């Protein structure tokens, strides 16, 4: 099927400042932060959009922090609590009243094993769309 227009080229999640004091214990984490991916002007005949997610993972399975803080990871979920680690896909239905599609996702930082250290948090997740 024909591709939609990708309205969301770029989407930034600002997790703010986390404190090593607060991230001493395993499983400590930031709040979830919403991030949306939007597609518009889907051709007639396009009824489903699949997003494929890719980014560097560490040995915890979650996304690697590519900033300087150690012992912290990034987690991407859908709207329903499902983890979308690298290689995951998600499919949504095109809304035929507007011929648009959306991916309501959420991101947080977490220290899987505890002991996050001072430094930056930086990560990027690439999305490729397929259509049917």
């Amino acid at each position: 099927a024909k591709p939609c227009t990708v309205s969301t080229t770029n989407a930034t999640v600002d997790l703010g400042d986390l404190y090593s004091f607060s991230l001493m214990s395993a499983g400590a984490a930031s709040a979830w932060h919403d991030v949306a991916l939007e597609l518009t002007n889907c051709p007639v005949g396009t009824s489903r959009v699949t997003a494929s997610f890719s980014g560097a993972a560490d040995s915890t399975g979650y996304y690697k922090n590519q900033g300087t803080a150690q012992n912290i990871q990034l987690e991407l979920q859908d709207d329903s609590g499902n983890t979308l680690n690298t290689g995951a896909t998600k499919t949504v239905q095109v809304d035929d009243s507007s011929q648009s599609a959306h991916f309501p996702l959420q991101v947080r930082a977490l220290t899987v094993n505890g002991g996050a250290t001072q430094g930056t948090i930086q990560a990027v997740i690439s999305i490729t769309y397929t259509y049917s």
């Binding site: 990708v6 969301t8 080229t9 770029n10 989407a11 930034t12 999640v13 600002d14 997790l15 703010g16 400042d17 986390l18 404190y19 090593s20 004091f21 991230l23 930031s30 991030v35 991916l37 997003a51 996304y63 900033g67 803080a69 912290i72 990034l74 991407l76 996702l105 991101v107 930082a109 996050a116 250290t117 001072q118 430094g119 930056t120 948090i121 930086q122 990560a123 990027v124 997740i125 690439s126 999305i127 490729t128 769309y129």
Partner: peptide
């Protein structure tokens, strides 16, 4: 490729 999610923040240690 089609979209990029950028995640940014900081871990501060004031000890």
């Amino acid at each position: 490729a089609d979209s990029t999610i950028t995640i940014r923040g900081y871990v501060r240690d004031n000890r």
